[PDB]
Each structure stands twice: as C-alpha cells, then as structure tokens.
Design a protein around this ligand. Structure first.
Ligand code: VUM
Ligand code: VUM
Ligand code: VUM
Ligand code: CA
Lengths: 612, 612
C-alpha cells in the first residue's frame, strides 16, 4: 500500500530531465543542439536519469527518430547499457521502441549489434494488479503483446529464440493467452507456432510447463479465455465422416479428463473462483464429457450415498429420544416455582434387558463419526489449511458443517463415559447439524438444485446485511422496555423481569411470533403504549417488509447465476467422487485406444446437425 | 404568482400596433406606405408601443429587412432610443436582430454608429424559472447563446469588450455553461477564449469571480454541466510519458480540493441538490481523488470515531438499568387492581458504598452531551439556520437526531438534581435515540450502505403515503368497536373499555400483533362478528399486502439512485472530517510542489490502459 513511492519516482523523472540540457534535447527534436553539445563540451555521455537511463532511452521513449540516430553515431556503445533502477531493471533500448509498435528504429538499432536476449526483470513487469500490463520479459514477447507482427518477422531473423521462459516461468505462447485484447490476438497465435522449424527431439513447443505447472491449453482453462479456447481445440479434434447435414467428429480428450496421477482441466476450473472461468463448462467438449459422466456412472453412486446417510441419522434420532432417565431423587426442589426439572439423567444403567438394542444404537453412530473424521481431516494435511475457506463459494460450507457434526457426537461419548451432568447441550447441536446436513444431497436432484444454491447466496449477503440493523433496533428498544417495567410486578406482564429475557422478548416480538404484552384487567404505564406503537411502525410495517422488497429484487438479478452455479456444483460432485472411489468402479468415459490404430490416449465422440 | 400581469402586457402589444397605421406598416413589408407616411404626415417619429418601443424595434422583431432600412434613412436617431418598460428595460434595437441570429441588418445597424455597450436589464432577462431563457445582458452574450458565430467576429470588431459582467455578476464565459444546448456550445467556448490578446496584467479571463463567488470551472461543477466539464479539464492536465498502450498523465488539482481557507469544488457538489450535479463524482479526476482519500487517511479515522461512540452508549445503558429504587412507602395503594407501581425512585441516595461507580456513570455520559452540543450547535451560527433542512437528503436527518439525543440527556440531569418525580419519560427517549443513532455509522461499510440510504428513502415517501390511509381506517373502526362494547362488561373482552385504548387496540390489530377478541365461553354481540370480518378483509388481505406490492415496486426503480447516493454519501463524510480534524492529521493528498520545478500548487497523477 505504498504506491506513493512509485508515484514519487515518475515525478522525479521530469525534474532530472529539466536539469540536464541534452536530455531536454533528447526529449524533443533539438538536433541542432546535438551537433553542438557533443562536439563542444565533454564527458556528457554516461550520466543517468532519475530511474537510471540514458539519453538513448529518452529519445526512444518519446519516439524521436532524428535525435536517436545522431546519438548512435556519436558513441555506438549506449545500446549495450540497460536501465538500472529497481522498478525498471535491465530494460534495454531495444525494449522501448518495440512497445511503441510502429518504428523503423528497430532496423537501425539492431543494425548496431544490438542484443535480443536481454533480461528485462523489474517490479513493474511482473503480473500483479498494481501494474496495468503483463508483457513477459523478452522483446520477442514485447512485440507479441502489442501486436506489431511486422516487427516479429524482423526480430526473429536476428537470432530470437522462441522457447524462452522468465522469472515467473511462462513462455511466449502463454503471454498471448493473458491479454484483454482477445479477438485478434488469436490471429497472431498462428504465427508464433508456425516459426517452429524442428521439434528439438522433445516436446513440440505447445506442451511446455511453467514453474506453476501448466500447459498453454490448460492456461486457457483457468483464466477463462473463451475465444482462445476454441482455436486451441482445432488442433485436437479431427472429423471422421460427413453425411449431408449430419456430421460426426472425434474429440481427443487426453488433457480434459481426470485420468492421471495429477491435476487435470476439470480439477482446476472448480478450484479457481474467476467468474469468466466457469463458462468453459458450456462448450462442446466439456459439456458432453460431464453429462455423460453424470446420467450414468455418477448418479446412482450419488444416491447410494444418499440412502446410506439418511439411514444414519434416523438410527441416531431414535438413539437420541430414548435417553436413560429416572425421577429426580436426592435433590428435592429447593426454589419454589422457579425450577422445573424432574429427570436428572442416569450414568451407569446399560445393564437392563431392554437397553441392549440402544447399545447397538450408540455403537452404530459412533463408528460413523470416526469414518467422517477419517475421510475429511486427511484432506487438509495433504491439501492446504485454507481450502475449506477456499472452495466456500461452490461446495464449501457443508465441509465445515460435517466436521462440526462429528466433533459434537464425539463430545457426547466423552461426557457419558465420564458420567457428566450437563448432557443435552452438545447433543442438541448434534441433531440440528445432522438433519440440516442432509441439505447437502439437494444438489443432485434438479428442481431442488437452484433452491439450495439460492439460499447459500441468501444466508450470506442479504441476511447479514439485515441482522446488524435488526440487532441495533432491538438492542435499544429492549433496554427501553426494561426500564419501563422496573415499576411493575412481574406477576402480570411477565415479559420483562430480567434484561437477559427482555433482549429475547424484543427479538421474538420483532418477528411477530409473540402476541404482544397486554393485560386489559389492570392498566399499563402510559409511556409503554407510545413507544411500543413506535416499535410496530418500524418492526412489522417498515423494517421487516423491506426483506421481501430485497428478496424480490435479488431473486431475479441472480436468476442467471443461479442456473449456472448449479451446473458448476454438479461438477464439484463429479470430480470429487471419482477421486475417492476406487478403480473397479468408475470406468473412464469414452472408447479406449491401442486396439484401433490410434495410440494410448482414450477418445470421445459427438455428433450434431449442421443446421445448413 | 401574478403571471397574468405579464400575460396582459403581451396582448396589449398587438392592440397598440393595430391602432397606429405605420406600426402595422412596420409589422409587414408595407414599404409603399413608408414612402407616404413620413413624407405626407408629420410628427409620427417618436410615439411608443405598449411596452415602450419604436417602429425600428417592430421591424427588427419580425425580421423585416426592407422596412427597417427605409426608416433608418428617414431619421437616423432611432437606434439610440432603447425600450423603456419594466419588463423590457433598456433593450436597444441592436439586441433584437442579434437574437434572430441570421441577419445582415447588424452590418447596416452598426453602420449608423450603433452602441454595443447598451445595458439590457429587465425582469424577463434575469435567471428565474419564470423565464424560459437566460441570455445575460450584453449583445456579445446575446450572440453567444443562440450560436451565431458569424455575428461575433463582426460585433467584436467594432469595440465589444469581453470582460463584462452584469447585475447578477456572471461573465460571458459563464453564460455558455448554463445552456441546455450543451453539445455544440462547447465548440463556441474555444472562440471566446481565443479573442484574448493580452492578459491585462491580471487574471487571464478564465479565473474571474462573480458576486456569488465562482470561477467558470467551478460553475460547471455546481450545475452539472458534464460535457463542458471535460473540455475545461483539457487545459489543466498535461501528459507525461506514453508507453505503448500504457499512458500516464498528471492532473493539476489546485481547485478540485478542499486545501484552502474557503469553498472548494467538493464542498459545493454536496451542498447543491441538483440530480445532474452528482455525476461529476464519476469522472476521472474527482473519483481518483475521493477514493485515494478514503482507502487511506479517512477510513481508520472513521472507525476510530466508530468504536468511541459504541463505548459511549454501552457506558450509558449500563448507567440506565441501575436506577436508584426502593419499595413504595408512604403512598400505600389506594385504587384496587388498577395501579401497579411499587418503586417510587430515590432522590438523595448517592451516599452508598456501591454507588460510587455509577457516579462515574453519569459523569461520563453528561460530559459527552456537552461535547455533542459544542460540536454541532456552532455549525448553525456560522452557517445558516436552514442547512439542517438543507442537507437533509444526503447526510441530514442524523444531525437532527444527535441534537435531540443530547437535549434529552441534559433533561434527565435537570430533573434528578431538582429531585423530580416523572423521570423515565425523557430517559426512554434518550435510549431509542441513542441506539438508533449508531445507525449513522452504517454509511462507512459497503454491504451496509445501500441499506441505510434505502430506508431513508422509505420512512419518508412511501410510509408517509400509507400512514395517512392507515390512520383513516383505524380511526373510524376503533370508533365502531367502542360503540359496540358499550353493552359489555370489561371483565371479559377487555380490549375496549376506554376510547384511548380502543384507538390503540385497533392499530395494534391492524398489523396483526394481537390475536383478536374472542371469548368462546359467552357469546358475542352479533354486529361485532360482521364488522370485524370486514376489518380483516381490509387490514390483512388488502391494505397491508399493498405495502409489499409497493416495497417491491420501489426497490428496483430506485436501484440505480441507491448505489449512486451511497457514493455521494461517502463524500459528505470525507469533506466533513477533513474540515474538523486538525492539520497534523489528514496530510493533503498528492505530491507537493516547490521541489521539482512545478510551482506551489500540489498535483496528483493517474495512469490507465488506452485499450488501443
Ligand atoms: O444453536 C444453534 C442452532 C442451530 C444452528 C445451525 N446453524 C448452523 C448451520 N446453519 C443453518 C442455516 C441453513 C442451512 O441450511 C445451511 C447452512 C450452511 C450452508 C447452507 C446452504 F445454503 F449452502 F445450503 C445451508 C443449515 C443450518 C446456520 C445455523 C447453530 N446454532
Ligand atoms: O429490455 C427490458 C429489460 C427489463 C424490463 C423490465 N424488467 C424489469 C422488472 N422485472 C421484474 C422485477 C421484479 C418483479 O418481478 C417484482 C415486482 C414487485 C414485487 C415482486 C415481489 F414482491 F413478488 F418480489 C416482484 C416485477 C418485474 C421484469 C423485467 C423490460 N425490458
Ligand atoms: O416514542 C418514540 C419512540 C421511538 C421513536 C423513533 N423515532 C425516532 C427515529 N426514527 C426511527 C426510524 C428509523 C431510524 O433508523 C431512522 C431515523 C431517521 C433516519 C434514518 C435513515 F434511514 F436515514 F437512516 C433512519 C431510526 C429510528 C423514527 C421514529 C419516536 N418516538
Ligand atoms: Ca401471528
């Protein structure tokens, strides 16, 4: 958060140029002074600017062709001297004129034995939202981003190497994927692949990995580059037989499927959270693969885990409602009419000839709680500890919720074995978080799927937009009613005797789920009737109806994210089950190879009407 | 509200022209009669019209070129005689033909030694919504508004002065800012500045103030002239270094910032209430200045005042709920079962070894109530007494609400020191208006900011559209139920015994926050069951559901004013805090001068991708 140090360096650049006389003469076409300043005075050859540059840079930066040519004749050594500051490090004079994208200077600058393999690092060239650009490092890539393809044929002639990575790791092909000018950068991608004379007996320049470990085809998948993803597909598929308006292709599918030992394409589209990245699930190779792996091979394995889970909690609620109880002995009721306990649960009463079935009842549900923690907790020691806060948009808060369920059921084993007294406090949390976690199996069924991803967008966002302003009005008005019934016997209107209940009975009246305090035999204090009518004119006629105004306004301008988030949620179920189920189940989708003269990669086909 | 006197004068103008024969001959091209009427008769040279005009005016008003030329030859003195009425005062014959915007008369009228410095005052030329025009006063400005630029080069040749103000104070440059024809009046603004040969060793004709104290650049800011605000910015900025698609400018910022001793641009955009004026907060110099002064330097100073205020009311509610009480002695209960008081608060009981902490409790909250009135009440003796009713749309009703809070807490000091009896009546107002005034700190946080400016648009407007028709149905039906339970013992159905409660129990049933009167052991009067079912068919199924129909219809057609009013509300917090905080805090945003050869004004920079 110190961009002011970057803002200081730019404004220091002018004042240094205003100081020296020939840098002003390099800023403009003051070529009359360039004949004088080098012939008459001395030693003004190697002084630097504010960010450590030469007069050759400044004439290159403000595209002054006439002044740059005289300075090269004066001392043909300034091309070898790069910039030296920490923002612009190593950036030579060739790099400046190529970004200006229309120069005949590069034919005159490379004529004086200029270098093409200069290392242009620095902090204004690495990928970050602080910069507005990402040009890579090499001048081959500098021409590749501004789309001056006349320069590229002239720069590749003098020894420019294609396969050149950088300090971040990506190649020249990867820079073309990451541009906002998507439309006619695709026409340049045909050129950079075409200047590949030999494959160097290794990977043929389209499969090179970076340090972050991606191919250029996969990198189109993560950043959501839709239009470039189509032209990359054109090398993979090949048509088989055309028959009038009916045609039939055969997609390659060696890289868009999870068959492997490491990352795939369907793994990374779910893992990223870019809004544009989840539109590749609508194009023709990916949609056919995910729907063939879900109408079969995925859905009866999803409802087999459906019915096993529903027969877990029903064998748990039946274990819950039969708690071992007795009458309340040896603790006879000391306060009068203010305690109403009469059970005081058992501790050593699993020796009874009915209770042997309930011993099975805990033994079933506590074996499953071991299996829950041994199927999710080993996914945050192999994976990072922030991925539970990382997949939270798509399929995330249920993985928080199932961990907390099994941690509560293990508490009630600890307390009952040690014979504790307070017992229903975790066991009531272990029965809401059970039955509200069968909510997770609503993403499978359509007509129940855009109604779970809607309420996830609503319990965050809009209701947290309201629960503050709900807990600001009621937190005050409860303190207004608790003053006003200090002068009142709680035998009538017992809604306010303790401030811990007055804060409750205001919240329970704010939603109109109590009637409202009225006795009608005795009178009321006079200030009550005014400040309660000011509550109703806020609570039931302004503040609560403004939910339905916001529920009805949100629910149609996320009605297109709704039906798309369900499609991305069906894939996070698809990739997760294939990774955890073994290999006898889930045969790999598609027809295999090494039988029909194709190779070892396994294919898929799709056919469609051309529509003429 | 007497436009009929203005309507009378226009219709009197025709009948006077119908009377005299040569004014009809001036109304048309009756030039045959003009050869006769001046040669044959006498003395018809100086008679006036209804609004005091000559025959030269009438031939100029209906653009009759032939009749105007003969009348100038007859007596070359009529050009010096202006109009003389109270509507059209001093308006000479040159002024009429210039408004018609296409005349060669002005070359023939200025040929006879016409004056250019005529003072055209009057009540139809000053800026008001009664007029439909605002032309200024000088004929240089008359040509400047109708955009006849061929006249302007011909009128400036004969001695027209540019720097000429009027009775309101504004200049010729200011008239071009206030036109509805915004698009190609900008192309005329280049001409009027270009005829400035010398700067007169003073301000160079672009910084002149009026009597209301504005520059032409600021006057574009107040009236919301968006397209003219762009071309005015073009003289202030100057580019620094262009680098491919990345460019980097340096805005001037000596006039769009509150650094001074008086008004600035950001002061006046909030103060005006013009709907178009709050769109200048989206253009590139103003948005970058307000967001840099809010991500830093403004937001932790806004939440430092956040947490200090929340630890004020919690140290006040804790002071509230511990009121000094006792049992109700010496006033034993005289009415039976109709009074239920048993406390009767203390008056001289701050001498007790627990109560010394609560003496700190009042002493904290009553020092702050002095500080509230000594930080807001001196903003309506220096400023006007109508600005609390003047900033009410943007950041206004909270400044009403914080004054009323501190005035109520000072009441409960007066009553407790004088040992009064009625005590909870202002102290309950001092606890709703406390906790509902921490609502004011919801404009700072996004996702809580379009939900406070929404409810301000709703407690006014739509709920005052409904609270009348709510208090017309219930005011009658309560009088219908209070008749019908005159014949009823209040021991059962005690919802109606006094008309002050029947008016309450109808309002509390109109929102369905009581059940509804039913006993079901004894019967009811028969007319009750009909006229109460006619209440429910209005109160819960027609009249109250029509809120949600209006809440759901308002909340999407102010959904663009919603997210814009929040941006203007963040600026009224920004300008206000910088004006009241001292100078060691809030350093002025941007890089300073007198170090880099620029001057003494302090600059800002911004850079953006050109997008080619
Ligand atoms: O004392 C209590 C009683 C009940 C609780 C229950 N929690 C835990 C779970 N959440 C509820 C709310 C709605 C629920 O469908 C849900 C949770 C998370 C995500 C979703 C989603 F919308 F994504 F499906 C739904 C379950 C129970 C919130 C309160 C806590 N503490
Ligand atoms: O090109 C266009 C674009 C937009 C349009 C008009 N919209 C905008 C309004 N929409 C909906 C918005 C919400 C709406 O259900 C609703 C109104 C009031 C109350 C509710 C409820 F209370 F039920 F939530 C819903 C009406 C129209 C329909 C299309 C026409 N033509
Ligand atoms: O006896 C009583 C008891 C309580 C009251 C409360 N008033 C005073 C303050 N306003 C309420 C309504 C909603 C509230 O957020 C608000 C007020 C003003 C402006 C806004 C805004 F929308 F601008 F934030 C909100 C505060 C309490 C109206 C009624 C009056 N009289
Ligand atoms: Ca109800």
């Amino acid at each position: 958060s110190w961009a002011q140090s970057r803002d200081e360096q730019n404004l220091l650049q002018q004042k240094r140029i205003w100081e020296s006389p020939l840098l002003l003469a390099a800023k403009d076409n003051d070529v009359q002074a360039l004949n004088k300043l080098l012939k008459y005075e001395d030693c003004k050859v190697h002084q630097r600017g504010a960010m450590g540059e030469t007069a050759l840079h400044i004439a290159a930066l403000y595209d002054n062709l006439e002044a740059a040519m005289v300075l090269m004749e004066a001392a043909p050594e300034l091309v070898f001297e790069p910039m030296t500051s920490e923002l612009y490090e190593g950036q030579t004079a060739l790099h400046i004129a190529v970004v200006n994208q229309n120069m005949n200077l590069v034919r005159a600058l490379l004529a004086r034995r200029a270098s093409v393999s200069a290392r242009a690092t620095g902090t204004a060239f690495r990928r970050s939202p602080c910069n507005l650009i990402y040009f890579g490092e090499h001048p081959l890539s500098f021409a590749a981003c501004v789309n001056s393809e006349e320069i590229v044929r002239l720069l590749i002639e003098h020894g420019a190497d294609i396969r050149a990575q950088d300090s971040l790791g990506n190649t020249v092909l990867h820079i073309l994927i990451l541009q906002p000018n998507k439309t006619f950068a695709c026409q340049m991608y045909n050129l950079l692949l075409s200047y590949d004379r030999h494959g160097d007996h290794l990977q043929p320049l389209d499969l090179v990995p970076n340090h972050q470990g991606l191919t250029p085809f996969k990198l189109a998948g993560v950043e959501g580059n839709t239009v470039m993803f189509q032209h990359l597909m054109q090398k993979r598929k090949h048509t088989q037989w055309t028959y009038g308006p009916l045609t039939s292709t055969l997609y390659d599918l060696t890289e868009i499927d999870s068959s492997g030992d490491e990352q795939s394409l369907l793994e990374l589209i779910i893992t990223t959270k870019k809004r544009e990245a989840r539109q590749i699930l609508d194009q023709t190779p990916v949609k056919e693969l995910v729907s063939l792996k879900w109408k079969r091979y995925g859905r009866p394995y999803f409802c087999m885990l459906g019915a096993i889970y529903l027969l877990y909690i029903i064998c748990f609620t039946m274990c819950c409602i039969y708690r071992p109880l007795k009458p309340r002995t040896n603790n006879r009721t000391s306060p009068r009419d203010n305690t109403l306990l009469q059970q005081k649960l058992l501790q050593e009463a699993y020796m009874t000839p009915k209770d042997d079935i309930r011993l099975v009842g805990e033994l079933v549900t506590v074996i499953g709680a071991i299996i829950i923690l041994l199927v999710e907790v080993p996914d945050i020691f192999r994976m990072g500890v922030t991925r539970f806060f990382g997949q939270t948009i798509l399929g995330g808060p249920f993985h928080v919720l199932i961990i907390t369920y099994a941690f509560m059921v293990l508490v009630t084993m600890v307390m009952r074995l040690i014979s504790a007294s307070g017992e229903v406090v975790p066991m009531s949390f272990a029965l809401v978080l059970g039955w509200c976690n069968v909510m997770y199996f609503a993403r499978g069924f359509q007509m129940l799927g855009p109604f779970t991803i809607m309420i996830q967008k609503m319990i965050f966002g809009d209701l947290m937009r309201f629960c503050w302003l709900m807990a600001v009005v009621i937190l005050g008005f409860a303190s207004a009613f608790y003053i006003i019934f200090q002068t009142e016997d709680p035998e009538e209107l017992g809604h306010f005797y303790d401030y811990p209940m007055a804060l409750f009975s205001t919240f329970e009246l704010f939603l109109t789920i109590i009637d409202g305090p009225a006795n009608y035999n005795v009178d009321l204090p006079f200030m009550y009737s005014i400040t309660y009518a000011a509550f109703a004119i806020i609570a039931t006629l302004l503040m609560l109806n403004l939910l339905i105004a916001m529920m009805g306004d949100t629910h149609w301008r996320v009605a297109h994210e709704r039906d798309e988030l369900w499609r991305a949620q069906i894939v996070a179920t698809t990739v997760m089950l294939e990774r955890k189920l073994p290999r006898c189940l889930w045969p790999r989708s598609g027809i295999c190879g090494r039988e029909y003269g194709l190779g070892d990669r396994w294919f898929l086909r799709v056919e469609d009407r051309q529509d003429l």
